[PDB]
Structure 1
Amino acid sequence: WFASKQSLSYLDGSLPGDYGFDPLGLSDPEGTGGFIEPRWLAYGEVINGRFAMLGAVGAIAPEYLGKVGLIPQETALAWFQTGVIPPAGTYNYWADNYTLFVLEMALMGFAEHRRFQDWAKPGSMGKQYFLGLEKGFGGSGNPAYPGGPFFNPLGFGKDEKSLKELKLKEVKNGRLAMLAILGYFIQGLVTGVGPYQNLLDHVADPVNNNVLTSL
């Protein structure tokens, strides 16, 4: 009763953004164990999507702004160029590049680890160990949406069953960011230059631009 592509039995449509598409049958629940369980993937697409959703913006925002914004030496190099050492060679920073990563892994280590606990236990995280926010923790029944408040300060459709009509929105945008970023990986890889900068050439003239053209 809904638009759908490809064939599988368990894609009920009970999951947001379900177009019933799993040609590889990754979500088939016959044999489950490990990371092949279906629910995990449901959680993963969303996490990967949220992160991707966010990253795509990072990839181009600095690019775009130095272009029509106030950014100097810190002028966005290609998104790829700051972090990976060989092309841009990076940029100095208040802190050493390797060290930041340690700190960076350190900070993430706390947030990410806890999130997992939410998945291994409902309210475990939100329970015990002192400090405020623990109450903040344990929120929700579902790990995917901790139902922050905290994570959601503003009900924002949380109450309305319309929250569904958000979930999908969140989900569809997520696939979109995902797709996008993968593009960069290639664009930047063959194109060099910046994804946004890359965009202009197609823009300055299009016949001249594109992959066939690119070659």
Structure 2
Amino acid sequence: SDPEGTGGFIEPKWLAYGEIINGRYAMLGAVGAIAPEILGKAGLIPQETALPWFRTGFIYNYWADSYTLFVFEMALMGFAEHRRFQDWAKPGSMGKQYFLGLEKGLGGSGEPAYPGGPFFNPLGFGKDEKKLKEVKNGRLAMLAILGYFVQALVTGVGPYQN
């Protein structure tokens, strides 16, 4: 049958809750701070023709990790985002195993969310010691923050505050 797409007060919000969750670790720059020593800046159009920003950052933007094959990625691995969205509609058989061979008890996990198959290795608490939209809410309070920090300048002048 024809594919589906139910709107209803607030799908737009479940997938809109989700969009920012992904963008909260695609926040990247300060979540994984080792990520950019200077990688937040993409480094457009700085040909051995010419130039970057403008007075920039300048003591390209950069050395680089370049290239092409940028569309093929975001498309091809977007050709997976909509599969853990179909496959586990369910009727399970994913573990096609191998025709012969009884020696395949070996499992791996199950369906995972978190420390894996299950949680696991029961046995725990000594020390580590002394609601999950908050695990969302605070990372747009990390997202939209670099947002203005791209253009984060007064330039002609600077910190009035100071």
Shorter-chain TM-score range = 0.3 to 0.5
Higher relative contact order (Cα pairs below 8 Å, separated by 6+ residues): 2
Which of 124, 128, 134 is equivalent to 2:103? Answer: 134
Deviation at 1:42, TM superposition (A): 7.4
Moved more, 180-189 or 61-70: 61-70
Q: 1:70 to 1:185 in 2, by over 3 A?
A: closer
Give RMSD over aligned pairs: 10.1
Cα deviation digits, residues 134-173 of structure 1 (max 9, x gap): 99999999898795789999999999999999xxxxx158
Q: TM-score, normalised by structure 2?
A: 0.36
**Alpha carbons 2:109, 2:118 under 8 Å: kept:** no
Helix, strand or coil at the partner of 2:29? helix
Percent of pairs with identical residues: 91
Contact 2:109 2:117 survives alignment (8 Å): yes
Distance 1:68 1:122 in 2: 43
SS of residue in 2 equivalent to 1:142: coil
User: In 2 relative to 1, CA 76–182 (structure 1 residues): closer, same or farther, beyond 3 Å?
Assistant: farther
CA distance in 2, matches of 1:111, 1:99: 20
Sort the Cα spacing of 1:94 and 1:38 in 2 relative to 1 into closer, same or farther, 3 A: same
Deviations 1:18-59 (A, max 9, x none): xxxxxxxxx999997268327724751563354334354468
Shift of 1:62: 2.4
* Unpaired runs of at least 5, structure 2: none
Task: Report whether the alignment pairs 1:182 with 2:146.
Answer: yes
Following superposition, the deviation at residue 114 of structure 1 comes to: 2.1
Unaligned runs of 5+ in 1: 1-26, 86-90, 166-170, 198-215
Contact 2:27 2:143 in 1 (8 A): no
Aligned in 2, Cα 1:31/1:94: closer, same or farther, shift over 3 Å? Answer: closer
- How far does residue 175 in structure 1 lie from its aligned partner after superposition? 2.1
- 1:37 aligned residue: 11
Instruction: Give, in whole Å, the separation in 1 of the partners of 2:103 and 2:122.
Output: 15
Change (3 A) 1:62 1:130: farther
Higher helix share: 1
Separation in 1, partners of 2:103, 2:148 = 39
Number of aligned residue pairs: give it: 161
Mapped contact 1:49–1:177 kept (Cα < 8 A)? no
